[PDB]
Amino acid sequence: MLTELEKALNSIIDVYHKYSLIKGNFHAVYRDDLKKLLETESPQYIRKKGADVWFKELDINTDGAVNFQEFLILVIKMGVAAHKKS
Amino acid sequence: MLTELEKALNSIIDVYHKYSLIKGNFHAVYRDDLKKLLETESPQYIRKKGADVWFKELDINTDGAVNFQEFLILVIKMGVAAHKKSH
Amino acid sequence: MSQLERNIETIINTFHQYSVKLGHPDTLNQGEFKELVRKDLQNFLKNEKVIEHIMEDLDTNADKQLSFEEFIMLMARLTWASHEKMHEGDEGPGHHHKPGLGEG
Amino acid sequence: MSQLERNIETIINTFHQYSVKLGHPDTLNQGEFKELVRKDLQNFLKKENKNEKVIEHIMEDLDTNADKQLSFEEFIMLMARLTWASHEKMHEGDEGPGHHHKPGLGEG
Ligand SMILES: [Ca+2]
Ligand SMILES: [Ca+2]
Ligand SMILES: [Ca+2]
Ligand SMILES: [Ca+2]
Ligand SMILES: [Ca+2]
Ligand SMILES: [Ca+2]
Ligand SMILES: [Ca+2]
Ligand SMILES: [Ca+2]
Ligand SMILES: [Ca+2]
Ligand SMILES: [Mg+2]
Ligand SMILES: [Mg+2]
Ligand SMILES: [Zn+2]
Ligand SMILES: [Zn+2]
């Protein structure tokens, strides 16, 4: 049985797949998918940067999508920003 | 024995550790270490961004260093940029 | 509050449950980290020397404490490791998840 | 030329040795990717190379835009992942003290 912390980490995988399984490559969140992800999952102080700005920042290999590793960059940045806020 | 490609990949590990083993955490390239890395390992069109700009970009968790996975961000970015220049 | 925001809050609240006990209230010492590992990562981290060295690897500034910023890289790494296990040996076609870390 | 620049050049030159064979000269189709993996990653992907379906899933996973080819941009993520995986193996079960690398991917 997973701990509370482990359940949170597992849920992060599930959140990514909510968007990456919409279409195409199963581990790819395309630009339009990332707009939906940010609008749904991220707080205003994160969204205000702009979806296209985040997408350029996160697609580090410029292949047109945010794979799971690239998404973890966003999770890390959101986590540190949430911590600094609280 | 490793292939030419596999040797290049293990060499990327060695390059990182040339700077991460300078001081402190063995998998941490601090801001001063990254300036050394960029001045030694990267072409002018990469260095011109500024070591400070690169560091802020690569230290995604703002903990004061570039670990190995953060370094691979740089490697990916330099490889795609080199590809675009070459082709 | 989105699911992702909730998951991040769980990470923050868990870290600070252990970091506030002793010494600096925003960092974990090695004993606090070991207790968090033993109890809160009992499935995802399945030898004492290995855990100590995991902390030394995560301790980016080398001050023998884990800050939250240092800690969240363990969270990312373990989330990655679990997904990787979900796809170990994957033949596809298409997408499916085997059980992740600590399961199956 | 720095060591790092040389390694990136090896990656680029290897990719293009295979990508120019057939179809679009800047992407790998399945045939070209399988040959590259079979020869140039024969040690790093030794176990995966035994199951053609595993190799095909690897390509499907890397084929970010889903067009059944690998661009150099998609390919370089395989290079980063395998470099990461080799380093992870060098530190499997690491007890310290200090820093030491066990044999990496495809060795030991
Ligand atoms: Ca990408
Ligand atoms: Ca260091
Ligand atoms: Ca960092
Ligand atoms: Ca403390
Ligand atoms: Ca520390
Ligand atoms: Ca040949
Ligand atoms: Ca060859
Ligand atoms: Ca493609
Ligand atoms: Ca490890
Ligand atoms: Mg997708
Ligand atoms: Mg071709
Ligand atoms: Zn998946
Ligand atoms: Zn190492």
Residue numbers in the entry:
A (entry chain B): 1 to 86
B (entry chain A): 1 to 87
C (entry chain D): 1 to 46, 51 to 108
D (entry chain C): 1 to 108
What does the paper say about this structure?
To define how CP chelates Zn2+ ions, we set out to determine the X‐ray crystal structure of Ca2+‐loaded, Zn2+‐bound CP*. Crystallization of Zn2+‐bound CP* proved successful with sub‐stoichiometric levels of Zn2+ in solution, yielding crystals that diffracted to 1.87 Å. Refinement of the data produced the expected symmetric dimer of heterodimers with Ca2+ ions in the EF‐hands and Zn2+ ions bound in both His6 sites. The structure of CP* with a Zn2+ ion bound revealed hexacoordinate Zn2+ binding in the His6 site as is observed for Mn2+ and Ni2+. So why then is the His6 site occupied but not the His3Asp site in the structure of CP* obtained with substoichiometric levels of Zn2+?
Calprotectin (CP) is an S100A8/S100A9 heterodimer that plays an important role in nutritional immunity at the host–microbe interface. CP contains one canonical tetrahedral His3Asp transition metal binding site formed by the side chains of His83 and His87 from S100A8 and His20 and Asp30 from S100A9.
